[PDB]
Amino acid sequence: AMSKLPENFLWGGAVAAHQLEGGWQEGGKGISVADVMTAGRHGVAREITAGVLEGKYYPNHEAIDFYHHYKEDVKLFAEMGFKCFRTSIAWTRIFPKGDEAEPNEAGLQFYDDLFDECLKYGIEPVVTLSHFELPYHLVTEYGGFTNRKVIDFFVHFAEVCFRRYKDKVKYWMTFNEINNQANYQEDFAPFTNSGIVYKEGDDREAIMYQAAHYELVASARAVKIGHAINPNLNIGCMVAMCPIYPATCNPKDILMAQKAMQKRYYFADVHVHGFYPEHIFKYWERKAIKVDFTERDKKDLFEGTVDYIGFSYYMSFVIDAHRENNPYYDYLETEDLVKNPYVKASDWDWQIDPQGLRYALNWFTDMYHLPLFIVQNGFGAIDQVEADGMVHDDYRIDYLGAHIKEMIKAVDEDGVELMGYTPWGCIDLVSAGTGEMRKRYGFIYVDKDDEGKGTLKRSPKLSFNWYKEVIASNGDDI
Amino acid sequence: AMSKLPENFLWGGAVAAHQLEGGWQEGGKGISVADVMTAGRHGVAREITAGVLEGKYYPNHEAIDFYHHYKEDVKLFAEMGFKCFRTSIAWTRIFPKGDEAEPNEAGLQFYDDLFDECLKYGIEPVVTLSHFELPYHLVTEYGGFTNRKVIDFFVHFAEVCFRRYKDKVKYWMTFNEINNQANYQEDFAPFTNSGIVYKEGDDREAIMYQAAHYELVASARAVKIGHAINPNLNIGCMVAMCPIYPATCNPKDILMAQKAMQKRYYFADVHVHGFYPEHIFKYWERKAIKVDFTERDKKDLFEGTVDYIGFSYYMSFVIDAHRENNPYYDYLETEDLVKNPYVKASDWDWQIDPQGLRYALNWFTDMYHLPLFIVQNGFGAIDQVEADGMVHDDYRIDYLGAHIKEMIKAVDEDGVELMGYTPWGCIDLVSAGTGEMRKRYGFIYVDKDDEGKGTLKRSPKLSFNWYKEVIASNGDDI
Ligand SMILES: O=P(O)(O)OC[C@H]1O[C@@H](Oc2ccccc2CO)[C@H](O)[C@@H](O)[C@@H]1O
Ligand SMILES: O=P(O)(O)OC[C@H]1O[C@@H](Oc2ccccc2CO)[C@H](O)[C@@H](O)[C@@H]1O
């Protein structure tokens, strides 16, 4: 009876290798998909270049040089009182090309040192095996996850990590936001989830269902392998959770929303229940989508269901039936969505809806009854440095706080099993969508701009002590 | 490849004993809760009288005398080509008082004859064990299902039926629309689901959670007993399914709807998963609701989950956050609901929303992945007899047809497991809500009015042959 959350609640901070590490060549790090994505801005898309071209600016190359400053940054984290720290093991640091019979020792010891650093301070590593950073070689030589071969490659990588870190890392996830690729219209998700370069004329949708299937099977094989290595390992899936509201109580909107939820979260059904929902098979029929799906796959999936559901939450969506010629209620994320009139939004147009997080949490609970883990939540905004040399980011404090409250009501009032809560980008890093430094998520300001300038000096923002106090009060004082 | 539904799809018609049988005293039939409910009209409520008073009119007493005319009526059913016929075994015909050590033979042979009649014609009986007709004695002497004793009484009744009809009836359900009592404000549901007479000052909500719990346990014990008697028996639950839409995409409405769905369908969670959702326990805490819930209950529930979900569908609801002083998002079915602007409605104000049936079907599938059975759907309307001596009820044909189409899209496009489809009140009978004859559901017109007059002659309506043809085309020709 100290607070409303469990005593061992896992407060932390989350990042991803390719977004902060830098030293993209150190250790012999192979070149990854992140490494061939140039910078952009709100509105302007990143360019996926055919290799590393001259004249282009690749922000992930240096990022914030975490690769060298990790001892300092971790000290900062422990100073806020992190109980956990989430990041990914850069696939490119362990298998630079991807097809190697042997893992890279420089890559492994590096993470041995990183986890060691966390553990010194009482911080529990939370590790994501694939986070938008697969070997670019795998893309050009195999076509990414459209090749069944790439499954073994991933499982190979996963077992190595599992065996190496079996006594260090308790919490794992396989594929970051695996369901992002439900949007197959734009190139981003297909490229970052699955290493898909689309060629002109391709059946984009179809190519992505097949890749997702391979990854689902790969995830399931890893889960089984990881448990055989250490049965205590908690291995969860990871889905991006953008709840999808019906615009109105018009039955057509209702059906749009339900159908879109099914297409956006069938991935979770497979991770959790171990089989595909029928509405996916029916749909593949209607669209003559052919999937290479063996009896063996079926067995693997059913056998490799997850321990818990990790997920990100930043916003919610609205949908309606406005689009013509759509009698099957297909879901086009680039077309069917509309703005929610009842909510504010960030300068990147990301809608602010704390209550949605509560909705999300109840949803997963009712659907699956598994432990849940908010492993990404946060607010991207422009920071100005006040005269006292500190960013007074109360806007960021507001966002996170409102979300923390809703998450607490979910545990306290609603009874969801929640493992912990991990704010995204706890230190300023390179954004995923645009490759911007100026879209900052951090409790820690890093002096680097989008033209690549700055000392890379770390300074705490206002929200640093605020959050330090949230952790200390285990949620009582927000 | 004959049609869109499975060859063995179970088309039928549904009724309930107390609503058509009559002969409420024949066989020594004990007096039931139906038997003490007087008539009413749209707007005017039925009176639950303390016993059978003089001067009051009890329509269920005679109803349509099905008890005598069943041989004729079944012939009518077979003429439409029913593959199944659904009704309830009148608890009062088997255990008139309820507490007897021995079942009533007159009551049993009666149903032996009724099922025999169906089977002659190739019709499969579908039986509901409790449908708003428990012994009134059980109410006055035990307080209905607020007494833990009444569990055994029900299980006793269920095993008798199971053993008697083990080779005759393949499809069973335990408690009709068990979740109706989520509305504990008005007296109807608590009285008809659970035999609850509220006394002034009572904690209505609390008294109903306890009764529901007893019934849930009773259902679970019966399921287990029935399987031990014949492992082939399909024993499903039965829930009233009124989908609950958010009025708008305002997050508050969203949360209202989700919370209301949880309170209205936790019954299904218990039937299906075998345990209570945590949000129910949390809620009982907040409201200091105490439930007598033993370790043994827990074991029974987990052990007595259902084979399939039977359900009724007539309409959908809309909800919003308008009501003040409601920061916990409690659900009051008498207060929180609003009209759906995008749909028409019957003269009893029941909203017409076929698409909702599709929503319903997808909902259950996604939540539970069990076979489903639409065992009640229909349209109550005033019938006028045309000059040719037939009711031209195209309004009724319209309603059912639209619903059949949506149900077919669900199977065909969405891939739900649906066992069959059973229109409600396939022959005109006494309505549940108001006790009216004039609120007609039938393919078969019965000449009896609400003042009790008429020859009780049966005549087919326009919709008779229409439906006969739906069955023959197995859904192709609607
Ligand atoms: O603001 P950024 O940097 O564009 O995103 C934030 C973070 O959210 C995660 O998910 C997203 C990434 C991009 C767009 C949307 C989402 C949310 O569904 C992503 O997995 C992270 O890698 C990313 O950095
Ligand atoms: O039109 P009536 O006769 O008032 O109802 C129709 C039928 O629907 C069933 O459910 C209902 C009964 C009454 C009100 C609403 C519902 C639907 O949720 C009931 O279980 C039947 O016994 C009943 O006859």
Residue numbers in the entry:
A (entry chain A), B (entry chain A): 0 to 477
Text of the article:
Specifically, the β-­glycosidic bond of 6′-P-β-glucoside is cleaved by 6-P-β-glucosidase (6PβGlu; EC 3.2.1.86), releasing 6-P-β-glucose (BG6; glycon), an important cellular precursor, and the remaining portion of the given substrate (aglycon). Here, the high-resolution crystal structures of GH1 6-P-β-glucosidases from Lactobacillus plantarum (LpPbg1) and Streptococcus mutans (SmBgl) and their complexes with ligands are reported. 6PβGlu is a single-domain protein that adopts a (β/α)8-barrel (TIM-barrel) structure, which is a typical fold of GH1-family members. The GH1-family enzymes utilize a double-displacement mechanism of catalysis with retention of configuration at the anomeric C atom of the glycon moiety.
For a mutated variant of the S. mutans enzyme (E375Q), the structure of a 6′-P-salicin complex has also been determined. The E375Q SmBgl–PSC crystals belonged to the tetragonal system, with one protein molecule present in the asymmetric unit of the P41212 unit cell. In the E375 QSmBgl–PSC structure the aromatic moiety of PSC occupies the aglycon site. Substrate-bound and product-bound complexes of SmBgl contain a phosphoryl group attached to the glucose ring occupying the phosphate-dedicated cavity. An analogous set of interactions links the anion (or a phosphoryl group) in SmBgl (E375Q SmBgl–PSC), with the exception of Ser432, which is substituted by Gly432, resulting in the elimination of one hydrogen bond. Interestingly, the active-site E375Q SmBgl mutant also showed some residual catalytic activity (0.8% of the wild-type enzyme activity detected for gentiobiose).
